[PDB]
Design an enzyme around this catalytic site. Structure first.
Site, PDB file in Angstrom:
ATOM      1  CG  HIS A 171      56.524  19.359  78.451  1.00 25.10           C
ATOM      2  ND1 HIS A 171      55.277  18.783  78.566  1.00 25.10           N
ATOM      3  CD2 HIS A 171      57.262  18.869  79.478  1.00 25.10           C
ATOM      4  CE1 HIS A 171      55.262  17.976  79.612  1.00 25.10           C
ATOM      5  NE2 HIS A 171      56.454  18.007  80.183  1.00 25.10           N
ATOM      6  CB  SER A 199      56.615  14.443  81.827  1.00 27.53           C
ATOM      7  OG  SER A 199      55.681  15.327  81.243  1.00 27.53           O
ATOM      8  CG  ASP A 223      53.081  18.698  75.958  1.00 22.62           C
ATOM      9  OD1 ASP A 223      54.127  18.781  75.300  1.00 22.62           O
ATOM     10  OD2 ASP A 223      53.077  18.378  77.156  1.00 22.62           O
TER      11      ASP A 223
END
Lengths: 275, 286, 288
Positions: free
Chosen positions: B45, B147, B75
């Site tokens: 993502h 992230s 992910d």
């Protein structure tokens, strides 16, 4: 293991007394936090804590309530200096923020909602002088808890020295104490911070002039699209190297900058301004 | 203070943490180098929708990245750059204990690193809305831009990928490395799939059966045209066996079937209205 | 290259007693929050706001056993609830003292947010008190542990594994002293009884102490009530109550707190400042 984990109780006891609450009155309404940097009543805080207040009250841990006049303020670093009246007030030891290392333990203390102190622990997450939205003010970032009312209180290393001013803005930001003490010396001695001014907006590459202005002094010297590699002899490895330099220049003094435009190197001189 | 801190761990483990940008360059997130010739891990993502992928090192070098492969379900994404790059040591996430200290490192906005400390709050492979990916939970601070970067044990080994998608989430490094081996060797994770959606078994829904230990997988919605439909599966069927493996966990079922090779039949043991049986399904893929 | 101590052993010894609290009725298995076992025969603490509105209450242990809970009693004002389930020698949490908790001490919240599995977060004691600008009664602990959905109602542990608070939520906990007080009351009576004020009070800073002749404390009544026991006693608004029944009032919250422990109908002797004059009035205390 856990019982052998060291904690901040002695540090809280030794370093809380100098942290104060900053309030105003309509004419017990908390505005935020701050701390005493001298036993005769000079107090640091954030500009955004005292902005818009007129009568400023400083509330101590002994729960004395003291009247404060605004010595000076600097929105750009968001630093404010107040003065109250006392003798041998509890005062915070000050440290060096340039020797703060990412990963070090730190402790924020505030007085958020009246005379009581609140405490949160964390580490130094990062330091810098830059953001995608600004090229001016250096910062410390910590993962300390965010509180309303803690803003303006000090940020402590484990020796109890102030290393920053915890300004709220999931990471939390502080003004490095080196910058804040610089600003506070200025406000205490002049009432206002003077900063040399260039009519340019810059971006990284040197410092890449992304927007030179009209009526800016830089326009009097040159045009946009210029990568400034030195100003007044100092190399520009980072774009943020440039503003602070120009900021520390006195208005009206000449600044000699070396710029590259089309592979061609040149030098232009500017009578720097203010604000 | 005599409290130990993370300064040395930051110095040893930051160099391999990188910034991920796309195309001036627009930071998308973080990632880390898992091999000195330029294989880089991150989150799906973080790169989703990006076309030009730029990897920004601590030395301020900028390198062009080709997308080696991605897996939205875990992910996890694998990128490749060209360079003896600093490489992050990898650890084991199954031996991670709740309460252990961890250090997340990101490179959120440009070449600079950001760091936050915490503990392992929890581990699992399950959530009320999903069964198909195990997780670590920590009380590390949440950052945009962190992230896709790594999650370090106190020895500097990566134990997870900080996804954080008020506790923060990471992909266990065991699962991420599994997925990255697959992506690196095939470009896609191929995963065996059954049509039915299942739910856990508590003592309230323990009817249609004589089972007296809350266990198994309670099919909540059997599907059409799934090979499971060909197996003879009805809603309300407790799957206790798959290919011989006990299902004490509902999540025991998906992961098992996911690693099953498409086209290979799976023999399942189910209880229907108290009677025990066995039916075989030619597993497929999503 | 620095290994500080961690909470893994503390997690192992102190998690077993932390439980999940669920309910079952609705239109399209629902966790309400956390709690802990304070007794091996099945007494369980939690927050009032976790069980409010639930009809069937289910308690879920780490061994994955699921047990029916009878509501022993609840106190919304402190947000404390006591449940009872059925077992023998259940894993039981040791209780500690919250009055000896020091700001800066390490603490560990343990919850059971979604099902049988536990979640854990660390932090320090940020602050203690019994007062806030939004309330003059409830004593509180504040910590910087992470805030979680599902952890509310679970315990807050000192590094020795003793419960020092109920993680109710910076994050808020009920000090375990107050919670155990409230839980003894609920367990023996089903409800907490509290003596009634009859007036809402405000603090005394320097300005309001100069206002009505108050030299140098107390509680400055900001709103006296009608039919309040104070009204039957003769309390006009603007009154600084410095003592009640002999107990000094240094801060306003000293007052409700006192009155809270008074038994309804009992004597209340209050010393007040009325327009510079000192006086004493008697009140037949009530209940909420």
């Amino acid at each position: 293991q856990a019982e052998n984990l060291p904690d901040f109780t002695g540090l809280v006891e030794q370093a809380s007394p100098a942290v104060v609450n900053i309030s105003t009155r309509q004419k017990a309404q908390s505005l935020g936090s701050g701390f005493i940097i001298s036993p005769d009543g000079y107090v640091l805080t954030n500009n955004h804590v005292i902005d818009g207040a007129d009568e400023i009250l400083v509330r101590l841990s002994d729960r004395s309530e003291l009247k404060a006049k605004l010595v000076g303020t600097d929105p750009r670093t968001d630093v404010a200096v107040l003065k109250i009246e006392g003798k041998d007030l509890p005062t915070a030891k000050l440290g060096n923020s340039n020797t703060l290392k990412v990963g070090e333990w730190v402790l924020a203390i505030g007085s958020p909602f009246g005379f009581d102190h609140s405490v949160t622990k964390g580490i130094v997450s990062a330091k810098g002088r830059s953001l995608p939205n600004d090229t001016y003010v250096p910062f410390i970032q910590t993962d300390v808890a965010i509180n309303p009312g803690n803003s303006g209180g000090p940020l402590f290393n484990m020796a109890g020295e102030v290393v920053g001013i915890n300004s709220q803005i999931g990471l939390s930001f502080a003004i490095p104490i080196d910058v804040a003490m610089d600003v506070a010396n200025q406000l205490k001695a002049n009432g206002k911070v003077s900063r040399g001014w260039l009519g340019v907006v810059i971006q990284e590459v040197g410092a890449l002039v992304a927007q030179v202005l009209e009526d800016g002094p830089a326009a009097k010297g040159g045009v946009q699209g210029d990568v400034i590699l030195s100003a007044n002899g100092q190399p520009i490895v980072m774009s943020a190297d440039l503003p602070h330099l120009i900021g520390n220049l006195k208005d009206g003094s000449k600044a000699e900058l070396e710029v590259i435009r089309d592979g061609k190197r040149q030098k232009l001189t500017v009578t720097v301004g203010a604000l």
